[PDB]
Design an enzyme around this catalytic site. Structure first.
Site, short mmCIF file in Angstrom:
data_model
loop_
_atom_site.label_atom_id
_atom_site.label_comp_id
_atom_site.label_asym_id
_atom_site.label_seq_id
_atom_site.Cartn_x
_atom_site.Cartn_y
_atom_site.Cartn_z
N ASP A 139 0.74 -1.19 -0.09
CA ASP A 139 -0.02 -0.09 0.05
C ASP A 139 0.87 1.43 -0.05
O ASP A 139 1.05 1.72 1.17
CB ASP A 139 -1.02 -0.02 1.31
CG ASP A 139 -1.93 1.03 1.43
OD1 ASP A 139 -1.96 1.50 0.25
OD2 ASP A 139 -2.75 0.86 2.13
N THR A 140 0.95 2.07 -1.25
CA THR A 140 2.00 3.19 -1.35
C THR A 140 1.24 4.43 -0.44
O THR A 140 1.82 5.54 -0.42
CB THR A 140 2.25 3.63 -2.59
OG1 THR A 140 1.14 3.96 -3.11
CG2 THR A 140 3.12 2.51 -3.35
N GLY A 141 -0.28 4.16 -0.25
CA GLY A 141 -0.73 5.16 0.36
C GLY A 141 -0.98 5.23 2.10
O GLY A 141 -1.60 5.82 2.74
#
Ligand SMILES: CC(C)(C)NC(=O)[C@@H]1C[C@@H]2CCCC[C@@H]2CN1C[C@@H](O)[C@H](Cc1ccccc1)NC(=O)[C@H](CC(N)=O)NC(=O)c1ccc2ccccc2n1
Lengths: 99, 99
Positions: free
Chosen positions: A25-27
């Site tokens: 999850d880059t967020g």
């Protein structure tokens, strides 16, 4: 390798002597795993996402293998519908977005 | 280019004649923008994240420029503390994770 995003970027992690699927999850600023038993001392913590807050147990200095890559860091355990690998551990294994 | 993850992967999008910062989120299935005025017909929709559900307005066939790359797709508008570019539009511009 280059993981495209047509489907969710899931991977296998090994933690606490167990194998699990997790979402890259880059967020997510943090790494949050479903309720499980972990070796160590923990502190309570509150985090927030799109719908509001959830209370999680913070674990530090946890070794977690992401697709075979060992990484050590803080893990958050709590009521998440899905295990999330956040940017904290991703930078350690060398992940990054390609534009 | 290769966007590392030491800091949040934010970018500038232009939508609705306006420039905004947005987060490249490989963990978001959808694209959700803060409340704003958009050209079109919309349907209500419910989505869910870590803390529970939020109700958003669904917009389809919206042109959105992400760092200069035009993309057309469904945009969700609603009470998100931060504009999120989901996997739906990211695949259109050719984003992907590198491991
Ligand atoms: C994990 C935590 C540290 C709390 N961080 C976050 O949650 C940050 C918070 C940031 C600021 C607020 C706005 C969202 C961004 C990005 N998120 C990460 C972000 O990636 C978040 C991760 C996630 C996945 C699944 C379930 C819950 C949460 N995704 C989402 O919230 C997106 C919302 C969307 N686009 O439709 N949800 C999903 O795409 C999704 C997928 C499967 C699911 C299964 C069951 C229940 C819910 C499910 N939600």
């Amino acid at each position: 390798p280059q993981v495209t995003l047509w489907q969710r970027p899931l991977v296998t992690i090994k933690i606490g002597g167990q194998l699990k699927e997790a979402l890259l999850d880059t967020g997510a600023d943090d790494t949050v795993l479903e309720e499980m038993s972990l070796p160590g001392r923990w502190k309570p913590k509150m985090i927030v996402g799109i719908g509001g807050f959830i209370k999680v147990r913070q674990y530090d200095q946890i070794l977690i293998e992401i697709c075979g890559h060992k990484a050590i860091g803080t893990v958050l355990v709590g009521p998440t519908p899905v295990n999330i690998i956040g940017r904290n551990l991703m930078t350690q294994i060398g992940c990054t977005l390609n534009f």
